[PDB]
Amino acid sequence: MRRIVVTGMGMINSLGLNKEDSFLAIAKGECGIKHIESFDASAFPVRIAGEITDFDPTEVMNPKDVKKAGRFIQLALKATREAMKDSGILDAHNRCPEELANRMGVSSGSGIGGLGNIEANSIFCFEKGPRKVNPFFITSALVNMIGGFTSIEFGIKGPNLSSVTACAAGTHAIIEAVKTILLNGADRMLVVGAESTICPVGIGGFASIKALSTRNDEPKKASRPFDKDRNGFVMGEGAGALVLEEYESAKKRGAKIYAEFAGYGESGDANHITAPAPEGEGAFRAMKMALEMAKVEVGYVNAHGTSTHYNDLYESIALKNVFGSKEKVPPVSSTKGQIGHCLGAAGALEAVISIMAMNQGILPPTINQETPDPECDLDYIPNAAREKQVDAVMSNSFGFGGTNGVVIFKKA
Amino acid sequence: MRRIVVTGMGMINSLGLNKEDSFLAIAKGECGIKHIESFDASAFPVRIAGEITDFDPTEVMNPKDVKKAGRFIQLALKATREAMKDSGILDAHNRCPEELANRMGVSSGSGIGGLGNIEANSIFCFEKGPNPFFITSALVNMIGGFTSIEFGIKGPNLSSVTACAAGTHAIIEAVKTILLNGADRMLVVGAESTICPVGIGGFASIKALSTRNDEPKKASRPFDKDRNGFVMGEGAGALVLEEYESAKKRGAKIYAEFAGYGESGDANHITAPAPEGEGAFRAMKMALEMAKVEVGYVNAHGTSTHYNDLYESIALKNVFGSKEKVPPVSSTKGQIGHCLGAAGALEAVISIMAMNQGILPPTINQETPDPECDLDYIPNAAREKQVDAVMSNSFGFGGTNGVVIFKKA
Numbered sequence: 095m096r097r098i099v100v101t102g103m104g105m106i107n108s109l110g111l112n113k114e115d116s117f118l119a120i121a122k123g124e125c126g127i128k129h130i131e132s133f134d135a136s137a138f139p140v141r142i143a144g145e146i147t148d149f150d151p152t153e154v155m156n157p158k159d160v161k162k163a164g165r166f167i168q169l170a171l172k173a174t175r176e177a178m179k180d181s182g183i184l185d186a187h188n189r190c191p192e193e194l195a196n197r198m199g200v201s202s203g204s205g206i207g208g209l210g211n212i213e214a215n216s217i218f219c220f221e222k223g224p225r226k227v228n229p230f231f232i233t234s235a236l237v238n239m240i241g242g243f244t245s246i247e248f249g250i251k252g253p254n255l256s257s258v259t260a261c262a263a264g265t266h267a268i269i270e271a272v273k274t275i276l277l278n279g280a281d282r283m284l285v286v287g288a289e290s291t292i293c294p295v296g297i298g299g300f301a302s303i304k305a306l307s308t309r310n311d312e313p314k315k316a317s318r319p320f321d322k323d324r325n326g327f328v329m330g331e332g333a334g335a336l337v338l339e340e341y342e343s344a345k346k347r348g349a350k351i352y353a354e355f356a357g358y359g360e361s362g363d364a365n366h367i368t369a370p371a372p373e374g375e376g377a378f379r380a381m382k383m384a385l386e387m388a389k390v391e392v393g394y395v396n397a398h399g400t401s402t403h404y405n406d407l408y409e410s411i412a413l414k415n416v417f418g419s420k421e422k423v424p425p426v427s428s429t430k431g432q433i434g435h436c437l438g439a440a441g442a443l444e445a446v447i448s449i450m451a452m453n454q455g456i457l458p459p460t461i462n463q464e465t466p467d468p469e470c471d472l473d474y475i476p477n478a479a480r481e482k483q484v485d486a487v488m489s490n491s492f493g494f495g496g497t498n499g500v501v502i503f504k505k506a
Numbered sequence: 507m508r509r510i511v512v513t514g515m516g517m518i519n520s521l522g523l524n525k526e527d528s529f530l531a532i533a534k535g536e537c538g539i540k541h542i543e544s545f546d547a548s549a550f551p552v553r554i555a556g557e558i559t560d561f562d563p564t565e566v567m568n569p570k571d572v573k574k575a576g577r578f579i580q581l582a583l584k585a586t587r588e589a590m591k592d593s594g595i596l597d598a599h600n601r602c603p604e605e606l607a608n609r610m611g612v613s614s615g616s617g618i619g620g621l622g623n624i625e626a627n628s629i630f631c632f633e634k635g636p637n638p639f640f641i642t643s644a645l646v647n648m649i650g651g652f653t654s655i656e657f658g659i660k661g662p663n664l665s666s667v668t669a670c671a672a673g674t675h676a677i678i679e680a681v682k683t684i685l686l687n688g689a690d691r692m693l694v695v696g697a698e699s700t701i702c703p704v705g706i707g708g709f710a711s712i713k714a715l716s717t718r719n720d721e722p723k724k725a726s727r728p729f730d731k732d733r734n735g736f737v738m739g740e741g742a743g744a745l746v747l748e749e750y751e752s753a754k755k756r757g758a759k760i761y762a763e764f765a766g767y768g769e770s771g772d773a774n775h776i777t778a779p780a781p782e783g784e785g786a787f788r789a790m791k792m793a794l795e796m797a798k799v800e801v802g803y804v805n806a807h808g809t810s811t812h813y814n815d816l817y818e819s820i821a822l823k824n825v826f827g828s829k830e831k832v833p834p835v836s837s838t839k840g841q842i843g844h845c846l847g848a849a850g851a852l853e854a855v856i857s858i859m860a861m862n863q864g865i866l867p868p869t870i871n872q873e874t875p876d877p878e879c880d881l882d883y884i885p886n887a888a889r890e891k892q893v894d895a896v897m898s899n900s901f902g903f904g905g906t907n908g909v910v911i912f913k914k915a
């Protein structure tokens with residue numbers, strides 16, 4: 095079986111423009127949730143989000159192409175430039191070498207893509223007619239245009255795949271790239287999950303299905319996975335990126351390896367379109383097959399932990415069942431307190447966070463742990479990071495539609 | 507390697523509500539393109555589309571669920587019901603047997619999902635403030651959400667969103683999943699319904715759509731000299747894939763066997779296909795090299811735009827060697843329009859039934875030969891010919907390419 099390793103990583107989110115700054119803030123328990131500025135949310139029932147306030151898209155595209163990409167793609171370009179530079183693959187012109195381009199692809203994930211662009215163009219058309227629809231609307235909004243823009247940026251011509259399984263899209267983007275390399279469809283794959291849906295129809299839409307915290311008075315206290323007073327997730331934006339590479343290719347070129355892919359699991363609840371299944375039965379199966387694939391001792395779990403009542407409860411039950419007992423569950427934390435629930439980007443962001451935690455021996459905390467919930471009784475690494483060396487990490491993603499994805503990376 | 511066979515199929519489009527009626531109409535060279543009536547297009551620059559005028563949503567959903575499911579999911583439920591019933595796997599409650607449920611998943615593809623639902627809620631928030639639809643109704647992976655609940659299938663639940671290639675990538679990702687032993691069976695469906703103001707307006711503003719509004723049935727004309735853009739269609743195609751031993755063990759009927767696939771990216775331009783169809787060439791080459799069969803029929807991407815049809819024809823010539831070495835080719839997008847993320851699933855069904863029946867459906871509206879598109883496109887009338895393997899191309903926006911090959915059982 096072909097071995098697969100991680101040779102480059104990057105991310106951007108509401109706590110940092112690169113993975114070093116972002117992980118530091120996350121491990122220190124900071125919080126990037128703020129009052130919404132990107133639109134006028136003053137009359138909305140939810141008025142907070144994990145907005146990135148310091149992102150300049152002209153650093154990653156010329157000001158003429160900025161209008162051709164939705165914000166989620168701009169964030170993807172930032173995170174993937176960071177990861178591709180980190181991998182050392184890029185040549186003197188910051189492109190994949192031409193003789194290697196056909197064997198490196200891209201796997202991109204997003205839950206909704208260019209929501210704000212669809213919104214704005216919907217209103218243009220409604221009010222002023224179809225000739226007011228921007229010529230660049232379609233390219234800016236389609237989810238796979240992450241792969242379109244990034245493949246052109248780096249000159250990578252291998253399989254160009256996209257995942258759109260809602261809150262699990264970023265994890266499925268990793269898994270689909272893994273399958274592709276395992277089956278010899280590529281020797282390297284750029285993986286990126288990216289989401290930016292902080293717009294009226296995005297916030298309004300998740301608020302009307304009652305999925306969002308309405309704790310508007312203290313934004314930094316609103317996202318509190320597994321806490322007794324959790325009352326909904328907080329939308330965040332961001333992108334995470336990883337370079338996956340076949341093992342011999344990485345070692346022969348002397349690339350520094352951050353982790354080795356060890357296992358994955360995929361499942362569907364087939365229960366409810368928005369509520370997770372009682373006992374986390376689908377999450378249990380995805381967790382179980384990843385663990386049986388990897389055959390390693392997981393020392394840290396980055397939970398899905400979106401800070402909703404049912405998700406955090408059912409995930410906690412599934413973790414206890416899959417590991418066999420409360421005491422056998424490794425330390426767990428959700429980092430969605432710090433950077434919010436970034437939807438399709440969550441899995442890619444949290445794979446990066448998990449691998450950095452392993453690399454640094456620092457397990458980031460779940461923040462806002464103020465009232466213990468008797469039904470969520472695991473070790474959630476409350477409020478302060480834990481210094482602990484681990485040899486493998488697990489990352490969970492349990493998304494709308496009952497679609498579940500789990501990945502395990504191990505020390506290399 | 508684990509072998510994979512097709513044990514059930516279904517489809518709905520602008521020429522039929524099931525695979526038997528639509529393939530017959532497609533093979534006869536009929537055209538489901540019509541004047542747009544699903545919204546007021548009277549002041550639009552494009553006023554034609556492959557609208558399904560006779561679909562009844564209430565057969566596959568309850569009225570409380572139309573708020574929860576965009577039209578593309580409704581079509582997916584129709585096509586997957588047909589396919590799952592066809593497969594014979596369903597028990598007395600139209601569900602997958604509980605003992606097989608954990609090992610059967612779903613792979614769904616769509617390019618844009620519930621565009622019109624997002625549009626409606628965008629307008630409604632703008633006019634009335636912080637809804638007509640649930641944001642759930644529009645997410646592409648809710649195809650897999652609804653269908654997995656519908657049949658009780660609990661295996662990997664995956665979604666593909668590579669624009670015009672989504673339906674073909676949905677097949678391929680299911681194939682990869684079965685090859686790697688992540689599933690023994692997978693329901694595959696591509697579904698698209700984006701015939702709405704902002705959807706027509708978005709493709710019109712990028713100059714991708716035919717403006718031959720006076721003659722709906724003559725507008726979609728792949729490889730013809732007077733083609734001038736694609737025509738939106740809506741629809742859904744569905745396939746049941748099963749590992750070979752699993753299928754024989756339960757006595758499945760076998761329509762075809764998976765033979766090979768190829769995937770590539772142009773990495774050239776966000777909307778313009780690459781010159782010489784260079785990425786399409788590579789995808790086709792890898793599928794042919796994997797499959798090791800003689801392809802007797804190609805269902806082209808053939809969207810009836812100037813550059814797609816030209817560059818696809820060049821790539822075909824380069825991959826097979828010369829004009830006379832290319833197998834018979836047809837695009838069926840004249841008949842049912844370009845169904846975007848659904849096209850690859852629809853066209854896999856069309857291609858497999860072509861093989862089963864020995865009837866190769868035509869490319870229609872072949873009126874003026876284009877000297878640059880000089881292949882055999884099976885013009886206007888279906889050809890009676892037995893084939894042992896079929897290839898289907900999907901070359902989507904963003905330069906993303908997918909090709910799949912199926913061979914005779």
Ligand SMILES: [Rb+]
Nearest residue numbers: 396397444490
């Ligand atoms: Rb996670």
Ligand SMILES: [Rb+]
Nearest residue numbers: 805806853899
């Ligand atoms: Rb095709």
